[PDB]
Ligand binder design. Structure first.
Ligand SMILES: COc1cc(-c2cncc(-c3ccc(C4CCN(C)CC4)cc3)c2C)cc(OC)c1OC
Length: 288
């Protein structure tokens, strides 16, 4: 009746970490990305698979799902997530070596805000969706597309509303001080907004103005170690209430001046004071 071609040719490893590995693969002559999960991160495969079995997200700024595969082996279970492949790699990678102009900076950050608002919004009726919070938004979990927009990846920690925790460097104050209202879905949206503000800062540093640009640095590079502890982060973000520095040179440029204001409104200590993703989008469409 029909042949179901399932062979994927794994061609090059494009990432390896505690999560497992990501490979560029080929299916029917077309590139796919294959994430092969480590045993330690099996629950991320289950959560993302459960989410996609509940709602088939389809959005230009969300990494495109293709398949979830579980294969029995002699003494283990092999778990793969298969998605669209973005050859330019992650935003984190891209910002190391690339500087941006005003148009490309805004296009990047608006595309991220668009994907995030799509996650956050509940849509009713047929072809709707539950509201979703990401819970691990960061520049390594955003991919750059050839058209200059980005897409958000890795829903392994995501939560829906109708051992894995987030990356500590990007954790909001209410996570670090354990005051987050865990029974309120809006709390998780507000944690994502904090992280979005950090990503906005990382990108804006790389936008040139008046011949000046900052080197790529991760948030809080000047105040915590590599692989900062939970306590290291809590002291900076909660006790001392530090925030990423805004360089003077941004205040000569109208775009970076507006982006600095936007960042600040993602970083309020009080989570309910932070802007929503929808409001961020509107503000970004009015810049330039
Ligand atoms: C964030 O997480 C996930 C990401 C991806 C994913 C999707 N497209 C492309 C990539 C990629 C391609 C290429 C490079 C490098 C390698 C070649 N050269 C050195 C420069 C560029 C980096 C990255 C990835 C990693 C897939 C995932 O799942 C299948 C992910 O997990 C949800």
């Amino acid at each position: 009746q029909r042949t179901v071609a399932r062979d994927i040719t794994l061609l090059e490893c494009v990432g390896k970490g505690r999560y497992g590995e990501v490979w560029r693969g080929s299916w029917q002559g077309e590139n796919v990305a294959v994430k092969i999960f480590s045993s330690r991160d099996e629950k991320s495969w289950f959560r993302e698979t459960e989410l996609y079995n509940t709602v088939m997200l389809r959005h230009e700024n969300i990494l495109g799902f293709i398949a979830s595969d579980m294969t029995s082996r002699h003494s283990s279970t092999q778990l793969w997530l298969i998605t669209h492949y973005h050859e330019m790699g992650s935003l984190y990678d891209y910002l190391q070596l690339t500087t941006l102009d005003t148009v490309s900076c805004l296009r990047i950050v608006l595309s991220i805000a668009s994907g995030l608002a799509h996650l956050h919004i509940e849509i009713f009726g047929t072809q709707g969706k539950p509201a979703i919070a990401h819970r691990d938004l960061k520049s390594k979990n955003i991919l750059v597309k050839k058209n200059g927009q980005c897409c958000i990846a890795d829903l392994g920690l995501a939560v829906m509303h109708s051992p894995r925790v987030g990356t500590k460097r990007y954790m909001a104050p209410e996570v670090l001080d354990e005051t987050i209202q865990v029974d309120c879905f809006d709390s998780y949206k507000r944690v994502d907004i904090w992280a979005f503000g950090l990503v906005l800062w990382e990108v804006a540093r790389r936008m040139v103005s008046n011949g000046i640009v900052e080197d790529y640095k991760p948030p809080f590079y000047d105040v915590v170690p590599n692989d900062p502890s939970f306590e290291d982060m809590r002291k900076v973000v909660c006790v001392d209430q530090q925030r990423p520095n805004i360089p003077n040179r941004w205040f000569s440029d109208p775009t970076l001046t507006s982006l600095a204001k936007l960042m600040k409104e993602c970083w309020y200590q009080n989570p309910s004071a932070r802007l929503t993703a929808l409001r961020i989008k509107k503000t970004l469409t009015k810049i330039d």
